[PDB]
Ligand binder design. Structure first.
Ligand code: SF4
Ligand SMILES: [Zn+2]
Ligand SMILES: [Zn+2]
Lengths: 714, 171
């Protein structure tokens, strides 16, 4: 299937493409031709990946100099595996068409914990542990000692990789993570480091955001080599939250105590090093005078001189002083306090800690800790986190804020206070990506309206188009139910949350919808506490028992183990005729991680508009700062955060292969024009005024009829 | 307040944390209920060490770590010296070399004998006070004044923003 696109001719593996695919390809080609960053939305969970990859490959063939390589990022490794599968299929199709191999390379990066071949680190699954063990095995000290070949466990894979892969790079091919593990085992090399080196000469590289956003690890692999590369973020509508998380650092009392203990161990190790080997490790002082990774981005990062901290004892005392200041500032009991610049000024005044020497604290920590030949960085990780916070605060506070919480939420009195350093704008941390890369395409599904995104992230978009899925059959028939059998408002307001009548309306709607809907249904609440209250009310009444009789019921919990077990049983229930009703939370990690396909989550129920609690002070900074700068109304941003989350958690049923399914929102709030307007275009256009505010019974009847229509073949 | 207790009367440190450390030439975790016990007999003598004190050598401080207490007080005293701004020296190394010597002096004073430090500090007193020390006292006073002025300007702007949006709504 060769498509005569306006720009050029583009190959395509599958037989047919919908008109929305034509629109997507033409708009994407327009953006690439303009060579300017832009954002676009496409409904389908699958199909967008293949269309995007095919268009990018064709554009690379036409103008190889224009685009050096493609950097395609996905939320999670299980998801990016499907992307690499799609890319492998596309490459096989193109190779068959051409009749011969071409110099094209495509690979996926992942954590050493996810992929590795060392038996010692294999049993351990905790990421910091894998990082520390690998650092110990690959340490420059361990490398030098391996040169001596003394009796000590040395990781042969990295040494063999240094010997061979340095000389010879991999010719070409596509390697999934699992297949790359096998390749590393066969060749006695690192599946991780081999891909890391291939990044230098790779046409396509795929990895999650935390490999491309956080300055600590993103920069090293996203160096200026890709000066003009097509960087693409997929389903990255929750990009602001992750970009903020890449900067926010949380300091707790337990973490601070662990830091103090680690610092004591550091002092003891320094004394032992002084008595054992002093001159050779002191040469570090000379190289320092000449002049865990830094959190400072490219331009913000500075390397002039370490500062007043030039020796191990001096640096240790500096960390002692800063840790004492943080300890006392956290121990203070008072209302939540915000102080972005005042915190730095008060630190400098109270404990005599100048911001310039504080700036290089984390970098000097890395160097000095390397000198100590520590067993691993896992033990001292809390100290490195505190150092990253210490350097960040002295680095900048213009678009940041230090929040102190002597008392935690959900606890009238708790002896574990927490100090947050949550950011307020993601533009600060995502600026390097936009500036360095010629164009970035934020391709997303279920995207809340694009107009806000340029305001939140400071960039000038080239194209702003919303693509609506078009099929010969109406795959999706969304509806909103606001009126119950009692013709009573069913809004899940904070003041209306306690309403037993509203809870009863929700329970009856779920009962009837489970009675009619086929096997497999997922209901998303607004919070764990609200979900528990509704479940308890239904349990006190007889509605819950009737729901249990009609279909099996499963519930989500904060604990990941129970969540995984419940979802595993839910899948089997969906396969069998019992069916299942999975209650979950919109913010729950399960909602974002899981993907619902044919005969999975057939009818997506949304109980109440997803709104975060109006007491969490972090969101207060994040929101009022957005009001002050970029001029976004607080209510506007709050409703945007609700609609984007709802679209995220309700857009799964249309994953791909044209699998029918209905999305019912049991809240009259969605019927409001603002919510409908902010809803994604593809869902909204299907939505109509006739079914906008159906009663519970009317919604059930129309759902039954729509399921009848979708049951029959094409 | 996290300290287990005074070397002698570790009681108050358990009942209430209101007591704050008292700095002395000895460098000690002294506590007010124990300061009264020192005043009653000796009147300015460390109980165990017996170090003489002119006038009780007592000043309030707030950190559970006695080493941090001594280090912070010594740094407070030292900052009065070597306060010249960085830009006064064009040499790249000299920017932080003198700070290295300053912190070395602080660590020296914390534990080792301070006689050499005092003699050196006399030498720096004579040579630098002639011109530079008083000049940088003036400049640091100017920057303290202007930082307090700038914070009051920030808070005037925030009060005006609050009250003007309130008057927008009511109008
Ligand atoms: S050097 Fe390679 S094989 Fe050895 S632990 Fe690290 S990633 Fe695994
Ligand atoms: Zn006492
Ligand atoms: Zn004493």
């Amino acid at each position: 299937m060769k498509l005569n696109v306006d720009g050029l001719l583009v190959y395509f593996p599958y037989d047919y493409i919908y008109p929305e695919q034509f629109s997507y390809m033409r708009e994407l080609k327009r953006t690439l031709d303009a060579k300017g960053h832009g954002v676009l939305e496409m409904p389908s969970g699958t199909g967008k990946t293949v269309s995007l990859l095919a268009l990018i490959m064709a554009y690379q063939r036409a103008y190889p100099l224009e685009v050096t390589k493609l950097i395609y990022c996905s939320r999670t490794v299980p998801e990016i595996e499907k992307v690499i599968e799609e890319l492998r299929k596309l490459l096989n199709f193109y190779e068959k068409q051409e009749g011969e191999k071409l110099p094209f390379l495509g690979l996926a990066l992942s954590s050493r914990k996810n992929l590795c071949i060392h038996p010692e680190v294999t049993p351990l699954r905790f990421g910091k542990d894998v990082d520390g063990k690998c650092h110990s095995l690959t340490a420059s000290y361990v490398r030098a000692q391996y040169q001596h070949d003394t009796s000590l466990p040395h990781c042969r894979f990295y040494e063999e990789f240094d010997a061979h892969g340095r000389e010879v790079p991999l010719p070409a091919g596509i390697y999934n993570l699992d297949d790359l593990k096998a390749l590393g085992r066969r060749q006695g090399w690192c599946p991780y480091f081999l891909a890391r080196y291939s990044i230098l000469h790779a046409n396509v590289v795929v990895y999650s955001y935390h490999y491309l956003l956080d300055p600590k690890i993103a920069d090293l692999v996203s160096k200026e080599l890709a000066r003009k590369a097509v960087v693409v973020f997929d389903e990255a509508h929750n990009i602001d939250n992750v970009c903020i998380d890449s900067m926010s650092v949380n300091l707790t009392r337990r973490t601070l105590d662990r830091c103090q203990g680690n610092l004591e161990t550091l002092q003891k190790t320094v004394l032992r090093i002084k008595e054992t080997d002093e001159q050779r490790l002191r040469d570090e002082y000379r190289r320092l005078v000449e002049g865990a990774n830094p959190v400072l981005p490219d331009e913000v990062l500075q390397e002039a001189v370490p500062g007043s901290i030039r020796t191990a004892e001096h640096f240790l005392g500096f960390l002692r002083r800063l840790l004492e200041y943080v300890k006392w500032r956290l121990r203070v009991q008072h209302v939540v306090q915000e102080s972005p610049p005042a915190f730095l000024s008060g630190l400098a005044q109270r404990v005599c800690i100048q911001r310039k020497p504080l700036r290089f604290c984390a970098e000097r920590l890395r160097s000095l800790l390397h000198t100590l030949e520590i067993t691993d960085l896992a033990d001292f990780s809390p100290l490195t986190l505190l150092a990253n916070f210490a350097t960040l605060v002295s680095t900048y506070a213009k678009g940041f804020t230090i929040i102190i919480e002597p008392f935690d939420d959900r606890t009238p009195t708790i002896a574990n206070p927490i100090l947050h350093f949550s950011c307020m704008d993601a533009s600060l941390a995502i600026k390097p990506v936009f500036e360095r890369f010629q164009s970035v395409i934020i391709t997303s599904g279920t995207l809340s309206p694009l107009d806000i995104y340029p305001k939140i992230l400071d960039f000038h978009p080239v194209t702003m188009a919303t693509f609506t899925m078009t099929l010969a059959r109406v795959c999706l028939c969304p509806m909103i139910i606001g009126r119950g059998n009692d013709q009573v408002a069913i809004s899940s307001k904070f003041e209306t949350r306690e309403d037993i009548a509203v809870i009863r309306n929700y329970g009856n709607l779920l009962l009837e919808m489970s009675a009619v809907v086929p096997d497999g249904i997922v209901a998303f609440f607004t919070s764990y506490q609200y979900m528990e209250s509704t479940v308890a009310s239904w349990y006190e009444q007889g509605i819950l028992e009737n729901i249990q009789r009609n279909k099996l019921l499963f519930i989500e919990t904060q604990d990941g183990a129970e969540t995984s077990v419940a979802l595993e049983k839910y899948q089997e229930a969906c396969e069998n005729g019992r069916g299942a009703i999975l209650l979950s939370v919109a913010r729950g990690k399960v909602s974002e991680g899981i993907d619902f396909v044919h005969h999975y989550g057939r009818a997506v129920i949304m109980f109440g508009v997803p709104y975060v609690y109006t007491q969490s002070r972090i969101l207060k900074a994040r929101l009022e700062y957005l009001r002050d700068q970029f001029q976004i109304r607080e209510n506007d941003f709050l409703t945007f955060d609700a609609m984007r989350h709802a679209a995220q958690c309700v857009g799964r049923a249309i994953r791909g292969k044209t699998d029918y399914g209905l999305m019912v929102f049991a809240d009259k709030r969605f019927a409001r024009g603002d919510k409908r307007g902010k809803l994604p275009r593809w869902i909204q256009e299907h939505l109509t005024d006739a079914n906008l505010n159906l009663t519970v019974d009317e919604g059930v009847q129309v759902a039954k009829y729509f399921l009848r229509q979708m049951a029959q073949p094409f | 307040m996290d300290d287990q207790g005074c070397p002698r009367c570790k009681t108050t440190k358990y009942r209430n944390p209101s007591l704050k450390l008292m700095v002395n030439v000895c460098g000690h975790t002294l506590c007010e209920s124990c300061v009264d016990l020192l005043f009653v007999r000796g009147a300015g003598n460390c109980p165990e060490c017996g170090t003489p004190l002119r006038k009780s050598n007592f000043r309030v401080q707030l950190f559970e770590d006695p080493t941090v207490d001594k280090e912070v007080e010594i740094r407070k005293k030292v900052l009065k010296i070597y306060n010249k701004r960085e830009e006064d020296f064009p040499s790249l190394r000299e920017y932080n070399d003198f700070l290295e010597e300053v912190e070395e002096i602080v660590f020296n004073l914390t534990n080792n004998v301070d006689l050499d430090n005092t003699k050196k500090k006399m030498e720096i007193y004579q040579k630098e006070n002639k011109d530079v020390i008083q000049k940088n006292k003036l400049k640091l006073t100017r920057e303290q004044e202007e930082l307090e002025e700038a914070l009051e300007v920030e808070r005037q702007e925030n009060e005006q923003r609050r009250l003007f949006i309130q008057k927008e709504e009511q109008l």
